[PDB]
Every structure is written in C-alpha cells, then in structure tokens.
C-alpha cells in the first residue's frame, strides 16, 4: 500500500471508523474481507489505535459541550 492509499485508508478508518464494509468499499472498492485481512498484515495498534481513539474523543467532547441547551 502506497502512502497515498494509506492516507485514504487513514481517512477511511478515521471518518467511517472500523466499519470494514465502508472501508473496503472506499479503499478496496469490492469486498469486506479485503480491509479485514489488511488489518492482520498492517496489524499496528499504535498509530491507527490512536487515530480511532482521537476520532472518538474529539467529536464526542464538543458534541456534549454543544448540547449545553439544558437548564
């Protein structure tokens, strides 16, 4: 995987999350098993683990902070 499509897989796994169907349709454009098996070859829960954790907390914190519409 060239860093361009790795950046599209970074974008995919950030935006759509770990939904292998959405990712394998985005970067793979065919079969869910592509991104699933990809995850065992490029099995590195350091960089990508942090990408998903940051995706979680960034959206979640401001989503709660914007629902201050409550007395």
Q: How many CB atoms lie within 10 A of CB 63?
A: 9
Q: What whole-number distance in Å separates Cα of residue 64 and Cα of residue 1?
A: 37
Q: What is the largest CA-CA distance in the chain?
A: 51
CB 61 within 8 A of CB 54: no
Cβ atoms 44, 7 nearer than 8 A: no
Task: Write out the residue range of the structural domain in which residue 12 sits.
Answer: 1-71
Q: What is the CATH number of the domain that holds 9?
A: 1.10.10.60
> Rounded to the nearest 5°, which phi and psi values hold at 65?
-70, -20
Number of domains in the chain: 1
């Amino acid at each position: 995987w060239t860093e361009e499509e790795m950046g599209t897989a970074k974008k995919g796994l950030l935006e759509h999350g770990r939904n292998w169907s959405a990712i394998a349709r985005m970067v793979g454009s065919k079969t869910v098993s592509q991104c699933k098996n990809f995850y065992f070859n490029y099995k590195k829960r350091q960089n990508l683990d942090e990408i998903l954790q940051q995706h979680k907390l960034k959206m979640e914190k401001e989503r709660n902070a914007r629902r201050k519409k409550k007395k």
